[PDB]
Amino acid sequence: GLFGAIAGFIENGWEGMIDGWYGFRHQNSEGTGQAADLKSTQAAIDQINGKLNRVIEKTNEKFHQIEKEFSEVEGRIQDLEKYVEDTKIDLWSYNAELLVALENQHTIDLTDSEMNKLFEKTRRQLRENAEEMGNGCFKIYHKCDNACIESIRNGTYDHDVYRDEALNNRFQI
């Protein structure tokens, strides 16, 4: 949406990731793996469930009102009675339409936003030790086994610990 990550710079989604909404896929020396990011996944969920509650909140609750179906023709009062209901239904039918179109647009942008935030954050962790391949993947210019990937994923990766190694491979080997 407004951001460019979803259906944007991230070519497509992973039909296989069934444990989270947003996630990681790496390929190091030891092999390949996948893991959902529970943190960003819950931010999107919380926000969506938050609007869901607002929307499907608490009901009209009306009792004795006015008649809406008529068996005999009467003119003036009956005319006005019907117009009152008609213009009402019309105004509530617009509200419902618009409300659903606004929310939907926002839900998309918002979920596009949480993707793009996962990216920048992960990007800010890698410091000078990586480059962005432009497809949502970072090329890590240093040996990174599984415990190394895990630290990125869990937010504890220290970039100094691999900087020079990184810098070396990066800048003309």
Binding site: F63, H64, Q65, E69
Partner: protein, 55 residues
Amino acid sequence: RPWVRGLSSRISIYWTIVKPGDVLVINSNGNLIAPRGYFKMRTGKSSIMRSDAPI
């Protein structure tokens, strides 16, 4: 009037609400279809609906 259940005469119904401390006074010289008391009035969540739907 057209025959309706034998008859060709009719009866017109009217009503009167008596507020506390006020008095009702029926006064006539014929054709009256007098009352037999009053119905209590309650304000609340009640209403009415037309439907041949099962309950």
